[PDB]
Amino acid sequence: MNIFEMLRIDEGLRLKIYKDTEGYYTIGIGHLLTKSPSLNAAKSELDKAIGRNCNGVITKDEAEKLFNQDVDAAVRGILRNAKLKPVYDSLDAVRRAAAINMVFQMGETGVAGFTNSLRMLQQKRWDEAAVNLAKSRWYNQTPNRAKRVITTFRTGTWDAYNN
């Protein structure tokens, strides 16, 4: 297990534009295209991202390319964020993957807003952190996914992903 396999489990793989859990146009492995309700706007973003006229459909190789970029972008987001970087630097590799997962799903700004959880994580108060993390819109809207990510922070194991 690693961050790629983890996110592939959490996000799935779809080769045609679909709507994510928030109703937003998405493709591939959780590649958000736009928050606009315009399918045409989403198709335009897709064509810009892939570099050809795709008419809403991509290949598996293209999906994996966008995914690799998106994982890289999440890590970059963390390292450039003054709230996230000290916590990330404090974590072991397994828990780092949990943090990347969160940023992938919610964005850098959104995760930087989990001030109290981040402090508990930095303190290595894992059970406390896990309780605090679940007091969130995130948990309430995507509870099975959030439970997996929280288990990963709580235990520093991949036990929630041995599917």
Domains of the chain: 3-161 (1.10.530.40)
The strand pairing partners of 25, in sequence order, are: 19
Residue at token pair 């709507």: 19
Which residue in the list 5, 10, 20, 72 is annotated as catalytic?
A: 20
User: Phi, psi at residue 28, to the nearest 5°?
Assistant: 75, -130
Laid out side by side, the sheet with 25-28 consists of: 14-19, 25-28, 31-32
Annotated active-site residue 127? The verdict is no
Q: How far apart are CA 6 and CA 81, in angstroms?
A: 23
Helices and strands (DSSP H and E) totals, the chain: 10, 3
Q: How far apart are CA 71 and CA 4, in angstroms?
A: 8
Contact between 127 and 96 under an 8 Å Cβ cutoff? The reply is no
Annotated active-site residue 92? The verdict is no
Which residue in the list 10, 11, 45, 108 is annotated as catalytic?
A: 11
Determination technique used:
X-ray
Tokens of 70: 């998106």
The letter for the amino acid at 153 is F
Q: What share of the chain is helix, strand, coil (3-state, %, to 5)?
A: 65, 10, 30
